[PDB]
Symmetry: C3
Subunit: 81 residues, 3 copies
């Protein structure tokens, strides 16, 4: 009988400690990202494989610059005719 009563208390202690761990785990869990709210590495391209807005604005301007270049000749050439 004295042993059972002692074991009861030991179990209760373990229960208290488990409940404390559970609370801590829940706090940490809530700081983790849900896979639902993120894309995997397979759903995405890295920085290295992509142009940003500016890199695109640059590439596009490269085309517009040559268009301007040509515009400046055309109207000189028509006026030369």
């Amino acid at each position: 009988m004295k042993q059972i009563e002692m074991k009861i208390e030991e179990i209760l202690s373990k229960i208290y400690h488990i409940e404390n761990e559970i609370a801590r785990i829940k706090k940490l869990i809530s700081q983790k990202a849900n896979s639902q709210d993120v894309y995997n590495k397979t759903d995405l391209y890295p920085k290295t494989d992509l142009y940003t807005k500016t890199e695109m604005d640059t590439a596009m301007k490269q085309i517009e610059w040559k268009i301007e270049e040509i515009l400046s000749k055309i109207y000189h050439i028509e006026n030369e005719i």
Copy 2:
């Protein structure tokens, strides 16, 4: 005090039942979290704000092809003018 031991046993069981439920829930939730191994960090990626989509690019480009067409038609005409 057998009835009394039995009473503490019941109290324990109830706590145990609940802990078991929590554990099952936590494991479900854990399995919906993303492994840092399977994701790029913020430093390995650009945000929405720093990128153009495909359609925004396809849009910008066809606008560019419209001006090119325009300029082609001035050139054609200048070639034909000279010609005579």
Copy 3:
């Protein structure tokens, strides 16, 4: 009495297993991504909504064609004058 001692042992068994699960959970938790260290799906575009560098370099080369067409004419036409 033998029944109470037998239930105690059943409880201890449950406790053993819960403790094992708790340790495991903590291990898995530590392999998860902090939401602080990632962008969500709303802060990003997927592979499907973006052109890579080569896809862009490809799309641009059709435009550079036409530019080369015109520039090459202009310069022999200026001589022709």
